[PDB]
Short mmCIF file of C-alpha atoms and ligand atoms in Angstrom, two decimals:
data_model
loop_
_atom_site.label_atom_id
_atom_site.label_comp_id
_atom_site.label_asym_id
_atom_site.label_seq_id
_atom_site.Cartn_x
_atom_site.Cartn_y
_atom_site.Cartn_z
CA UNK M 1 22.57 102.59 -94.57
CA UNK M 2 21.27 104.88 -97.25
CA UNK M 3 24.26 104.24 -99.50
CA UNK M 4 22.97 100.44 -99.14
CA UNK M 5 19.37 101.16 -100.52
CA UNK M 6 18.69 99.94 -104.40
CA UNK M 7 14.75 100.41 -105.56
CA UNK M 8 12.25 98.03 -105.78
CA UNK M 9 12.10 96.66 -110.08
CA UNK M 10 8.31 97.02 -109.60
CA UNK M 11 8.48 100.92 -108.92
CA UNK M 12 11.03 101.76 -111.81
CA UNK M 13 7.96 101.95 -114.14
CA UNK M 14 5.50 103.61 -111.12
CA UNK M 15 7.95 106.15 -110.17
CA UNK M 16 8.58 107.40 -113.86
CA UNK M 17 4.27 108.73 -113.50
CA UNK M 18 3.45 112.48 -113.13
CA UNK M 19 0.61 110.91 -110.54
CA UNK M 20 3.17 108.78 -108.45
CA UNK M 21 2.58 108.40 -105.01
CA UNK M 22 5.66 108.56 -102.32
CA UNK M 23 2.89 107.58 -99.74
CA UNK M 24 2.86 104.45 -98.76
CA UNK M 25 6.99 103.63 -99.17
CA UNK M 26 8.23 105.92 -96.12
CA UNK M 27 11.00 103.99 -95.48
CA UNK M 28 12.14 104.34 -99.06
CA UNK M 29 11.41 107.68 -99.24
CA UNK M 30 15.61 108.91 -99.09
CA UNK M 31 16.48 105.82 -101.22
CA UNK M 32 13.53 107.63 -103.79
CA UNK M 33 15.61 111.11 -103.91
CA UNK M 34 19.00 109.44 -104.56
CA UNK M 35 17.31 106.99 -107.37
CA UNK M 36 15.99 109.98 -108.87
CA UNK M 37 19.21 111.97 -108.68
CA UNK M 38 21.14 108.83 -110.14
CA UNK M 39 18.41 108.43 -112.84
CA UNK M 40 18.62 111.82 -114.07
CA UNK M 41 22.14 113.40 -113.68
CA UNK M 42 23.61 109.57 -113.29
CA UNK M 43 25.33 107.95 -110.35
CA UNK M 44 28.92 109.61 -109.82
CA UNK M 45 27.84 112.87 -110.27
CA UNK M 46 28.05 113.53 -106.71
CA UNK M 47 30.16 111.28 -104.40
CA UNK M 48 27.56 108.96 -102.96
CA UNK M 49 28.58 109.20 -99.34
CA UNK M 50 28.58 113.25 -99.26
CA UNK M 51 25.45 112.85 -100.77
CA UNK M 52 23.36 110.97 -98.70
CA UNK M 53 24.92 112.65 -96.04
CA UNK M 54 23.90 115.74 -97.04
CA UNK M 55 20.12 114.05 -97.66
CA UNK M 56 19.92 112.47 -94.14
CA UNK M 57 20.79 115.83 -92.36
CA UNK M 58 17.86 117.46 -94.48
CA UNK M 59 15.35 115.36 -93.37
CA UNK M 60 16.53 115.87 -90.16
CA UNK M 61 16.06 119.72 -90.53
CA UNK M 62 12.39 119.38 -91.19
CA UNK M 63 10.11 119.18 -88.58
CA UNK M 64 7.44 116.94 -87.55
CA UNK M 65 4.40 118.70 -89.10
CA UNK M 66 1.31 118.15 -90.49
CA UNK M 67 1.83 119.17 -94.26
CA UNK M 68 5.05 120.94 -94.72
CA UNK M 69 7.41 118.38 -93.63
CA UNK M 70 9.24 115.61 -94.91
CA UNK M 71 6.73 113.58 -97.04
CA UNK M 72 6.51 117.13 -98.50
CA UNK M 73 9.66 117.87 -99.90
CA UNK M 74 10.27 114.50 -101.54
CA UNK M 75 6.67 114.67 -103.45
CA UNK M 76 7.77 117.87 -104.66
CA UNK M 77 11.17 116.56 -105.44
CA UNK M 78 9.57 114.14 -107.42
CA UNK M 79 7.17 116.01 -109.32
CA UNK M 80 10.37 118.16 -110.48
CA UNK M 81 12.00 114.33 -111.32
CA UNK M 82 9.41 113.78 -113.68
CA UNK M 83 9.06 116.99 -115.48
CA UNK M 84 12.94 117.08 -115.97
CA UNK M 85 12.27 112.99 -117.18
CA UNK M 86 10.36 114.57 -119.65
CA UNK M 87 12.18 117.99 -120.96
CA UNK M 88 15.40 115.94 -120.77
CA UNK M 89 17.08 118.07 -123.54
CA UNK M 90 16.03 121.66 -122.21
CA UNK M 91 17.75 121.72 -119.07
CA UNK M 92 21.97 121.97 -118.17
CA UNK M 93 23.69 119.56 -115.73
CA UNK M 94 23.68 122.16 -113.29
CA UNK M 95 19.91 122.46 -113.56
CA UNK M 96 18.81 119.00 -113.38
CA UNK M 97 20.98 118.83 -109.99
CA UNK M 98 20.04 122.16 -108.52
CA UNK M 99 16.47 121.90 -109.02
CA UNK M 100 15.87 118.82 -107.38
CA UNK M 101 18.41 119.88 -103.99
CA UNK M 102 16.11 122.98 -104.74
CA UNK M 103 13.03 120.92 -104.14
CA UNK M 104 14.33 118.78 -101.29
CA UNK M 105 15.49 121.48 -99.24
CA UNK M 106 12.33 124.22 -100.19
CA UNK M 107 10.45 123.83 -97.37
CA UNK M 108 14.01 123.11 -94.49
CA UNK M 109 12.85 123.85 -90.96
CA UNK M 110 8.98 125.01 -91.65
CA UNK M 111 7.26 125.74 -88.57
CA UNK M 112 3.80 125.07 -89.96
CA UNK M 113 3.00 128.77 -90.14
CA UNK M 114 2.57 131.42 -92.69
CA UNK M 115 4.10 134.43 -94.08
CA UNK M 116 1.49 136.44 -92.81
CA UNK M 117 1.82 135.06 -89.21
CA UNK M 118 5.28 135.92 -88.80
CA UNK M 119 5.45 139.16 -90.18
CA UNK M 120 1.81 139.96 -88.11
CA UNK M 121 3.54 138.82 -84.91
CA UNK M 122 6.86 140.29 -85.48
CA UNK M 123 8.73 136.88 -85.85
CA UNK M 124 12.41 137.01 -85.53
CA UNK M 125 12.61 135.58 -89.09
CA UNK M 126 10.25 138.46 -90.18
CA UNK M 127 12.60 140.66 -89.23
CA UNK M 128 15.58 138.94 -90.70
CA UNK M 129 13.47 138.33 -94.00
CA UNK M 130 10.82 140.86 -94.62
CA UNK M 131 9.76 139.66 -97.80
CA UNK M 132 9.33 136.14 -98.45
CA UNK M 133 10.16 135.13 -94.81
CA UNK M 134 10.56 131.70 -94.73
CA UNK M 135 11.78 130.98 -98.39
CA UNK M 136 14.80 132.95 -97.43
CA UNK M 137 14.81 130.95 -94.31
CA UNK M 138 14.71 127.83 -96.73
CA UNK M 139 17.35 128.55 -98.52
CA UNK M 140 19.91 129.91 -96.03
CA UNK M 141 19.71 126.71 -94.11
CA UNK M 142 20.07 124.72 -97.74
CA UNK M 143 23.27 126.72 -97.40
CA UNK M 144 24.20 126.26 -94.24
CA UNK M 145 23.52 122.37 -94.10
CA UNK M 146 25.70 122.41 -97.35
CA UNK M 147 29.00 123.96 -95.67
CA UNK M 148 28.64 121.22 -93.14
CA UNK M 149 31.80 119.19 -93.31
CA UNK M 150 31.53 115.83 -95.83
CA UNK M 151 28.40 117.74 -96.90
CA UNK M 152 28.96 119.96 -99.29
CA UNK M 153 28.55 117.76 -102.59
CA UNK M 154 28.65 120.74 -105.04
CA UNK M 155 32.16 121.07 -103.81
CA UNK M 156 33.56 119.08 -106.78
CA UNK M 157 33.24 121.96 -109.47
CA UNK M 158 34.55 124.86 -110.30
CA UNK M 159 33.97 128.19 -108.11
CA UNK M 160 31.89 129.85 -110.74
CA UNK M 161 29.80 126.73 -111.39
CA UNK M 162 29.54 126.77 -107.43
CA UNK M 163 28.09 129.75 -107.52
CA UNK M 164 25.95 129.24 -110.54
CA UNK M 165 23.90 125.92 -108.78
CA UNK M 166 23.64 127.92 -105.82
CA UNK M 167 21.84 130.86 -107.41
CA UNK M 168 20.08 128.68 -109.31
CA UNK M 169 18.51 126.78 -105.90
CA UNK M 170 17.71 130.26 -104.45
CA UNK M 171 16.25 131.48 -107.44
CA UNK M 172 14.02 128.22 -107.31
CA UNK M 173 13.39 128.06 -103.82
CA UNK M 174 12.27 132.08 -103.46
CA UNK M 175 9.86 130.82 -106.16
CA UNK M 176 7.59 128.61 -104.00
CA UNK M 177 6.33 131.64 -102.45
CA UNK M 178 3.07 131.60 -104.10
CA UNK M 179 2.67 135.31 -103.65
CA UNK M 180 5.40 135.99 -106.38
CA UNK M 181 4.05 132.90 -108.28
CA UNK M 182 1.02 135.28 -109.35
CA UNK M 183 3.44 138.03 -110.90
CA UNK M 184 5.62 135.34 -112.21
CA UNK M 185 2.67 132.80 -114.36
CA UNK M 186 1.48 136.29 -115.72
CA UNK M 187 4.88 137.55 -116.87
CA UNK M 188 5.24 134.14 -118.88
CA UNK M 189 2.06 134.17 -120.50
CA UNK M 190 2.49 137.55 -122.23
CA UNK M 191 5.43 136.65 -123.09
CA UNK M 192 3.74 132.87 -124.63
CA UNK M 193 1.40 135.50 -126.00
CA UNK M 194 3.90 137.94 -127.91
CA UNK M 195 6.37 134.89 -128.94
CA UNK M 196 8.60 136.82 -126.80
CA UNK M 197 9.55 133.58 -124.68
CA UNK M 198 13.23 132.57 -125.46
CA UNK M 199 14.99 129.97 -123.25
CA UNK M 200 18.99 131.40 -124.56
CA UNK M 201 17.74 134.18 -121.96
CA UNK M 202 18.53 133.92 -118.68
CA UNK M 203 15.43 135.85 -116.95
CA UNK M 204 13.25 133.75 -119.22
CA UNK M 205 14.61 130.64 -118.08
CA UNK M 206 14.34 131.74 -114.52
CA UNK M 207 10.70 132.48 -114.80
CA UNK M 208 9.96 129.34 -116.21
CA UNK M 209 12.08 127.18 -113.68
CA UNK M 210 9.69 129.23 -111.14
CA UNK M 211 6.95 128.20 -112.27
CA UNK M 212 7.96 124.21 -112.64
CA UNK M 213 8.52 125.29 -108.62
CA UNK M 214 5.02 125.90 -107.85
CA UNK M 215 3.82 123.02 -110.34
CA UNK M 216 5.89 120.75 -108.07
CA UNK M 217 4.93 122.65 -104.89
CA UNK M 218 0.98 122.01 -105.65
CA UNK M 219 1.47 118.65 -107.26
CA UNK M 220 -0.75 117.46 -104.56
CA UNK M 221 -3.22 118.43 -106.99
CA UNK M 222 -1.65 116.67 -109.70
CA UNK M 223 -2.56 112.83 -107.93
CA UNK M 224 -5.08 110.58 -108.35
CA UNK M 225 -8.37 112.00 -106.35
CA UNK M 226 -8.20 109.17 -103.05
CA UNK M 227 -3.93 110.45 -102.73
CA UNK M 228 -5.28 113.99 -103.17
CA UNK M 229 -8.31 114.41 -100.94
CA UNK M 230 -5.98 112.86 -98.27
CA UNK M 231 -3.24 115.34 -98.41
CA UNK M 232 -5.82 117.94 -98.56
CA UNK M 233 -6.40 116.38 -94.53
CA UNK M 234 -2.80 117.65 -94.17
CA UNK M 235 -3.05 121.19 -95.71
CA UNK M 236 -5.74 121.61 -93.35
CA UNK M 237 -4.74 120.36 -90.05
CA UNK M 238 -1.32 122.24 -90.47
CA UNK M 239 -3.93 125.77 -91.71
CA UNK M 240 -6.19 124.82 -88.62
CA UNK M 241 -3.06 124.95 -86.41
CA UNK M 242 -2.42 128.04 -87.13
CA UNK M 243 -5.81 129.18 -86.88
CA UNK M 244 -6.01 127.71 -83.33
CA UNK M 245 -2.74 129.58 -82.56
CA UNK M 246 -4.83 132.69 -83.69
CA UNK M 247 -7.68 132.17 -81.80
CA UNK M 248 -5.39 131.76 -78.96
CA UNK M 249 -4.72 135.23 -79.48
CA UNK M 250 -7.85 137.05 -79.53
CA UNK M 251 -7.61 137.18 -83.22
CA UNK M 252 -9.79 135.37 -85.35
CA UNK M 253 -8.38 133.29 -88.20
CA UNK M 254 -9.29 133.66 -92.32
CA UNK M 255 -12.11 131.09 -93.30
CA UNK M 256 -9.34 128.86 -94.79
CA UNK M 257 -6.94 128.25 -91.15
CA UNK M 258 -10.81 127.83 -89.48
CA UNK M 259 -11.61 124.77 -88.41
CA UNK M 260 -14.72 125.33 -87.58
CA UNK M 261 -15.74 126.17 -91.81
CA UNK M 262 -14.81 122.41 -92.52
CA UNK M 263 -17.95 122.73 -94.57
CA UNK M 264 -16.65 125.46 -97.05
CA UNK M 265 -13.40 123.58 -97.71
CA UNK M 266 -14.93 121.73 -100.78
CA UNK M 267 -15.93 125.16 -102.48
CA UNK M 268 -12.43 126.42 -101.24
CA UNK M 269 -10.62 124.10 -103.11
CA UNK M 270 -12.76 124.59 -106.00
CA UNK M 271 -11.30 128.24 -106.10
CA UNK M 272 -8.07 127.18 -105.49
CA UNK M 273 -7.76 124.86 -108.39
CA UNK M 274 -9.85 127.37 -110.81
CA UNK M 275 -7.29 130.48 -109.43
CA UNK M 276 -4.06 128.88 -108.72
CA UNK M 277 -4.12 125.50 -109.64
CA UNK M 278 -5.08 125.42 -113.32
CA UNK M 279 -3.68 128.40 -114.07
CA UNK M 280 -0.17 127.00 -113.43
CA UNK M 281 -0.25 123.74 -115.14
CA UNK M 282 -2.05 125.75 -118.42
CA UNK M 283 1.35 128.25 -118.97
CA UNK M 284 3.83 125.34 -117.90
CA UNK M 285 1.64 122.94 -120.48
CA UNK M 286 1.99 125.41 -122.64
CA UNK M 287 5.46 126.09 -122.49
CA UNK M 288 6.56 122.35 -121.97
CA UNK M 289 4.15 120.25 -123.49
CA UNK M 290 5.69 117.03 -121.96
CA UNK M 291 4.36 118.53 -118.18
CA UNK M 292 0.38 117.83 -119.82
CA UNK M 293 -0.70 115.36 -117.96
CA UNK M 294 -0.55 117.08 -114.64
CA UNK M 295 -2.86 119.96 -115.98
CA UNK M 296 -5.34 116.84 -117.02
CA UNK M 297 -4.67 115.34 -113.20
CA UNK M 298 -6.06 118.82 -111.86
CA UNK M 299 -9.09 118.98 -113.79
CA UNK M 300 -9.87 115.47 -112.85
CA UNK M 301 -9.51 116.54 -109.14
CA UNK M 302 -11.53 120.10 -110.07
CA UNK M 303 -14.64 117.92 -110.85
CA UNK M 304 -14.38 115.62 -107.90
CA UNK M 305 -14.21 118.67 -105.87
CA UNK M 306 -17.18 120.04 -107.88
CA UNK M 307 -19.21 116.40 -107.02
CA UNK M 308 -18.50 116.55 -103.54
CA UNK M 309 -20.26 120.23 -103.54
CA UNK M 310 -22.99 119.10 -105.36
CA UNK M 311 -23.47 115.78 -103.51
CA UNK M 312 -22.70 113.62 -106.43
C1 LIG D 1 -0.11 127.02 -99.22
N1 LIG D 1 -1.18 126.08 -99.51
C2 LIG D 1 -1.04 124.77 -98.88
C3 LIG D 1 -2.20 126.44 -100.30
O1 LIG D 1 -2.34 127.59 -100.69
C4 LIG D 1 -3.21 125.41 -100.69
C5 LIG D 1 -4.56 125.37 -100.44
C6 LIG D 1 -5.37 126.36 -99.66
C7 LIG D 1 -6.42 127.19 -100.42
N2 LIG D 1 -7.44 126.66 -99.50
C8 LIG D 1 -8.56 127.32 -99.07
C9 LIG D 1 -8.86 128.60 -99.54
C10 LIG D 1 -10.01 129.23 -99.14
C11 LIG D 1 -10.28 130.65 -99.58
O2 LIG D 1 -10.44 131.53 -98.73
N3 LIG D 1 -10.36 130.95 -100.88
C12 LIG D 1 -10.21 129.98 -101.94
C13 LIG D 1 -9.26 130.43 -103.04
N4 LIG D 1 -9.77 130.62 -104.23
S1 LIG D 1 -7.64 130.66 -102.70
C14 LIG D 1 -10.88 128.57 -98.24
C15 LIG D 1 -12.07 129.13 -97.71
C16 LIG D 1 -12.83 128.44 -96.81
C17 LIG D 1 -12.46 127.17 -96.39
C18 LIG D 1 -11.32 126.59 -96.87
C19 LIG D 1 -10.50 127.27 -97.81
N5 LIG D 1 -9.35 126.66 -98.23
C20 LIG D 1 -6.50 125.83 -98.75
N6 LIG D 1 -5.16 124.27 -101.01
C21 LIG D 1 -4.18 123.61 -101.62
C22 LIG D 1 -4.21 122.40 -102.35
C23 LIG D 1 -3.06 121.91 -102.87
C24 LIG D 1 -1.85 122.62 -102.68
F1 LIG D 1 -0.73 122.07 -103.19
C25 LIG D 1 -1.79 123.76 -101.99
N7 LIG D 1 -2.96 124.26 -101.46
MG1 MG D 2 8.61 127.09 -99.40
ZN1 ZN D 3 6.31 123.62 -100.31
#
């Protein structure tokens, strides 16, 4: 049924935007992903039926939460769509393909709960992955859901190309842990800074595809202010989850995974944007000038933040 799924005309144009919307098409939602993998590495690249094999069985994988599900993974899949839409000369082949399977399967079999939560409670993941829990979880079931038979759809190239997309999708999905995003965005801007940055090296390269991870990752952020205040609903109710699960336990959750500091979420996302948010989409503006107008969607969300703390 998926192979039999052609786009809408009217969303050719609508899906090309940085501030696209994947909300209200659900049902096209899989047929999105393979347009945007035959608009930008071209129909038989992969063979269609391994490849919407391989994209059924990933939905599939992720589970019915609140935030971190499959609505999720395609937004950020998109978000990477458009950037690459608009660097199309920067990035290999192998990169436009890996990055978006990166960004499809980034977030396979999320539970809803943090990194802190499973290495506080002594998860069996946590002790399988110490660091970066789940985005090692992420990417070993990428792999695993790729070995499936019919699946794997980088099987038509060579062994060391094999190996190079897959390194590359690790690479990119250990990124979207927004603890090593810090490290990562400061690393690039000294080396913006020094005129050190050059994309023939592979570390720099790596860096920067990292940081197009977390642009994609937050791109909530990046959407017109009625898309983004209700996705913030999401963040939260999947955060509050794990807050009740906390205070199931005795142990009383940070302000941010407490429901019961609805009222400081405005000012919290205020923070977020000034800390986080902004400074991502400055060094990846910087760097690829194409990628501006999701650094002028976030400001235009920062100040609607900023009017609903002021009451205006
Ligand atoms: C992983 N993931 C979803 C995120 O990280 C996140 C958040 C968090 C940050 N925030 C807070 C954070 C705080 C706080 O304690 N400090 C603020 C900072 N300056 S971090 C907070 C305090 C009280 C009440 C609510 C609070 N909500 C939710 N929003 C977004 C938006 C788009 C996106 F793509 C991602 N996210
Ligand atoms: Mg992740
Ligand atoms: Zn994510």
């Amino acid at each position: 049924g998926l192979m039999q799924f052609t786009l809408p005309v009217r969303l050719c144009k609508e899906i090309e935007l940085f501030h696209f919307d994947i909300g209200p098409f659900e049902n096209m939602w899989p047929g999105i992903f393979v347009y945007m993998v035959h608009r930008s590495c071209g129909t038989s690249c992969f063979e269609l039926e391994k490849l919407c094999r391989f994209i059924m069985s990933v939905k599939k994988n992720y589970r019915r939460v609140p935030y971190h599900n499959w609505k999720h993974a395609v937004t950020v899949a998109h978000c990477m769509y458009a950037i690459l839409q608009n660097n199309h000369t920067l990035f290999t082949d192998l990169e436009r393909k890996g990055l978006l399977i990166a960004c499809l399967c980034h977030d396979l079999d999320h539970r809803g709960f943090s990194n802190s939560y499973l290495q506080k409670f002594d998860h069996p993941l946590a002790a399988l992955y110490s660091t970066s829990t789940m985005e090692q979880h992420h990417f070993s079931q990428t792999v695993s859901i790729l070995q499936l038979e019919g699946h794997n759809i980088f099987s038509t190239l060579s062994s060391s190309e094999y190996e190079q997309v897959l390194e590359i999708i690790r690479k990119a999905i250990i990124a979207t842990d927004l603890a090593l995003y810090f490290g990562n965005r400061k690393q690039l801007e000294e080396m913006y800074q020094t005129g050190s940055l050059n994309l023939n090296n592979q570390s720099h390269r790596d860096r920067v595809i990292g940081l197009m991870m977390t642009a994609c990752d937050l791109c909530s952020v990046t959407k017109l202010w009625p898309v983004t205040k209700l996705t913030a609903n999401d963040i939260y109710a999947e955060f509050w989850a794990e807050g009740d699960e906390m205070k199931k336990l005795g142990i009383q959750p940070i302000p941010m995974m407490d429901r019961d500091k609805k009222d400081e979420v405005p000012q919290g996302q205020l923070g977020f944007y000034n800390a986080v948010a902004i400074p991502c989409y400055t060094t990846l503006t910087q760097i690829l000038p194409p990628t501006e107008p999701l650094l002028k969607a976030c400001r235009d969300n920062l100040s609607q933040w900023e009017k609903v703390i002021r009451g205006e």
